Amino acid sequence: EEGRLTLAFSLHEVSRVLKDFLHDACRGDLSRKSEDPWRDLFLWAVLQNRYEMATYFWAMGREGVAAALAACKIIKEMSHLEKEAEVARTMREAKYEQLALDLFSECYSNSEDRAFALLVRRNHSWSRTTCLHLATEADAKAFFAHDGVQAFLTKIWWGDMATGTPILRLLGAFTCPALIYTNLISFFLLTRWRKFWGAPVTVFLGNVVMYFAFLFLFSYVLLVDFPQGPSGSEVTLYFWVFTLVLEEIRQGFFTNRLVKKFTLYVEDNWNKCDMVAIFLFIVGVTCRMVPSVFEAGRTVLAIDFMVFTLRLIHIFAIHKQLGPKIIIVERMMKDVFFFLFFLSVWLVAYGVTTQALLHPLEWIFRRVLYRPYLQIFGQIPLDEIDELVTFLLVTNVLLMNLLIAMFSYTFQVVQGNADMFWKFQRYHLIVEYHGRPALAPPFILLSHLSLVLKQVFPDPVDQKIITWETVQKENFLSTMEKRRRDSEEEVLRKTAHRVDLIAKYIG
Amino acid sequence: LYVEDNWNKCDMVAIFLFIVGVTCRMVPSVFEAGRTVLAIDFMVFTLRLIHIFAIHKQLGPKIIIVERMMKDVFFFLFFLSVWLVAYGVTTQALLHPLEWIFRRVLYRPYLQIFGQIPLDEIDELVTFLLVTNVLLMNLLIAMFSY
Amino acid sequence: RDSEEEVLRKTAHRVDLIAKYIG
Numbered sequence A: 001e002e003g004r005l006t007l008a009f010s011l012h013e014v015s016r017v018l019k020d021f022l023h024d025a026c027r028g029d030l031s032r033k034s035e036d037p038w039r040d041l042f043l044w045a046v047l048q049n050r051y052e053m054a055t056y057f058w059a060m061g062r063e064g065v066a067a068a069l070a071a072c073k074i075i076k077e078m079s080h081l082e083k084e085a086e087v088a089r090t091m092r093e094a095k096y097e098q099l100a101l102d103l104f105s106e107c108y109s110n111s112e113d114r115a116f117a118l119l120v121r122r123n124h125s126w127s128r129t130t131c132l133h134l135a136t137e138a139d140a141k142a143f144f145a146h147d148g149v150q151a152f153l154t155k156i157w158w159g160d161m162a163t164g165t166p167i168l169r170l171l172g173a174f175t176c177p178a179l180i181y182t183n184l185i186s187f188f189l190l191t192r193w194r195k196f197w198g199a200p201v202t203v204f205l206g207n208v209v210m211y212f213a214f215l216f217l218f219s220y221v222l223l224v225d226f227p228q229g230p231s232g233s234e235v236t237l238y239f240w241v242f243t244l245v246l247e248e249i250r251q252g253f254f255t256n257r258l259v260k261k262f263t264l265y266v267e268d269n270w271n272k273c274d275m276v277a278i279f280l281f282i283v284g285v286t287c288r289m290v291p292s293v294f295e296a297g298r299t300v301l302a303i304d305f306m307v308f309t310l311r312l313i314h315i316f317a318i319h320k321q322l323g324p325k326i327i328i329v330e331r332m333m334k335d336v337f338f339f340l341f342f343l344s345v346w347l348v349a350y351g352v353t354t355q356a357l358l359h360p361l362e363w364i365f366r367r368v369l370y371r372p373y374l375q376i377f378g379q380i381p382l383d384e385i386d387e388l389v390t391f392l393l394v395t396n397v398l399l400m401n402l403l404i405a406m407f408s409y410t411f412q413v414v415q416g417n418a419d420m421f422w423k424f425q426r427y428h429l430i431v432e433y434h435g436r437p438a439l440a441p442p443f444i445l446l447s448h449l450s451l452v453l454k455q456v457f458p459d460p461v462d463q464k465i466i467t468w469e470t471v472q473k474e475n476f477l478s479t480m481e482k483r484r485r486d487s488e489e490e491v492l493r494k495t496a497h498r499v500d501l502i503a504k505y506i507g
Numbered sequence B: 001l002y003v004e005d006n007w008n009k010c011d012m013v014a015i016f017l018f019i020v021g022v023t024c025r026m027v028p029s030v031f032e033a034g035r036t037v038l039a040i041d042f043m044v045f046t047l048r049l050i051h052i053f054a055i056h057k058q059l060g061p062k063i064i065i066v067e068r069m070m071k072d073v074f075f076f077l078f079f080l081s082v083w084l085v086a087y088g089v090t091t092q093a094l095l096h097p098l099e100w101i102f103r104r105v106l107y108r109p110y111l112q113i114f115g116q117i118p119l120d121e122i123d124e125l126v127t128f129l130l131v132t133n134v135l136l137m138n139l140l141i142a143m144f145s146y
Numbered sequence C: 001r002d003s004e005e006e007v008l009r010k011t012a013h014r015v016d017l018i019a020k021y022i023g
Helices: A002-006 A011-022 A037-047 A051-060 A065-081 A085-091 A096-110 A114-119 A131-137 A147-158 A167-175 A189-196 A200-224 A231-253 A258-265 A269-288 A294-304 A306-317 A325-358 A362-375 A389-434 A441-456 A459-485 A488-506 B006-025 B031-041 B043-054 B062-095 B099-112 B126-145 C004-022
Strands: none
Touching: A002 A011, A011 A065, A037 A051, A037 A065, A051 A065, A051 A459, A065 A085, A065 A096, A065 A131, A096 A114, A096 A147, A096 A459, A114 A131, A114 A147, A114 A459, A147 A200, A147 A389, A167 A200, A200 A231, A200 A306, A200 A389, A200 A441, A231 A258, A231 A269, A231 A441, A269 A294, A269 A306, A294 A306, A294 B062, A306 A325, A306 A389, A306 B062, A325 A362, A325 A389, A325 B062, A325 B126, A389 B126, A488 C004, B006 B031, B006 B043, B031 B043, B043 B062, B062 B099, B062 B126
């Protein structure tokens, strides 16, 4: 209808429907028999929400796990767009991701080196797209969780057996510039140089170091900064913040509709943490751009700097140990809120009634808010309080009990997040780094200069790997099939059918 | 092999304490230091003997659990202290305050955690001192249940 | 009816019956 208005189905019609759901860079003589038909058959089945014939189709298709994830995404789109909530859930019961996981599983146990090749391909079967591209575009969480997924990631983390080597030896070799040519740690001078400054652990360390020193030095110069704004502070601005915005944006601004891309860059929740610091950067910039209020010009940078600690705090996320820490904290805070508000309301009630019995703007706000909160912190000035009990007991009791009990269960949920938020958080960070330019924040200015200057200036193996996939796939099929034949319950049922038949014959 | 086992290393510190205090007494130039050396060293005694509780069935698992608890506490503690330092730096800026500076920056707030709150030196960052204080205790304690 | 335990019980009853007939 809409297409007609701009001018009952079509090749153009179904093609637009597809590109709408899969959003891929993948597109499109009715007499012409079309290529690789099992594909389109799978397509039609999935749309019709017929899991079974879909599965049979799946078997026919030469494509591997990548198609399956495509199914996952289309199914997600249809499930939320489904009207009949019963039909919505039934559609929501496909588990095509589970199947794709199976394919990847037998793929890894098969080759585990050709498998790593597999996931990194461009399946022309969806217009030469990379598997993970689909994985992301589908939020392939569980698929991201197959141990091989992490295999490919960790493998690409350094490129020079970084995972195999230890961190203590890693930083030591990072200390002496010739350690790679020294052969003390695993890895001519150009080869070693490319290796050491070419790793994602490498740039990760480098940027972390440059940023930490930026934070400490700007901290130090906040003392000299104590017209609103001195010279060296302006230096620190132009020297860290400017490049940061270049460093801060660029990596997110132009990923690979420009406005849509920008929206995507400022869409993720994790970035928003930086967003506050970015706002802190510009706001403090304006404050130094103002010597009328030196006190305020100092307050602005004073508050702003803590953003530094918050953004870097993400860095603990990559480490395995802190993997689940960020996962649990948000839940804990949420649990604390709801209880805290009620607790504070009850405390206010008891304080109000107590105050009325005693019968004794800035000072009032102080004596009403700062006094009892400090009474919670061991500052009890009896000289100002000594010449409501039911509240201060029952609320004090219920509040602590509720949040703490919730938190035990919250911690159980956190264990679930250890399984979940931890590993998932690792993968996103790994993907993000690989795209981060290697040079640290100081050298980030030079890296940006070089990039802007640059802007101003197989098939046999493919078919072989595909065949590997196909063989493994049929193997998976036969494996499940033999398991089902050996269904001991099915065994008994078959035996019983034979039994009753034979008894009838004896009769 | 003899100096390979982890348990022996506890003694190793005491052994080092023995030789080091030996040298300190082998030195009358600094009586104060000669006293500080044995003073510190002696506690090694308590630590090595503390193994003896290990043989008893009741304390059998106590040493097993303590190392894990300490490890769980570390990682959380470092982040918690970092956040506390952030909020304190924020406060000092508005507050506008080598040995005395180190004192007022480190001994003052740690003793503020231990009930020594000298309002005469503090009274004429909130988001931090709340959210870090919350998350830190929750994390380590939950980890500790497990 | 599809009670698998009931299935087995019924099969066994048939089994013993058929065995008796064979005897």
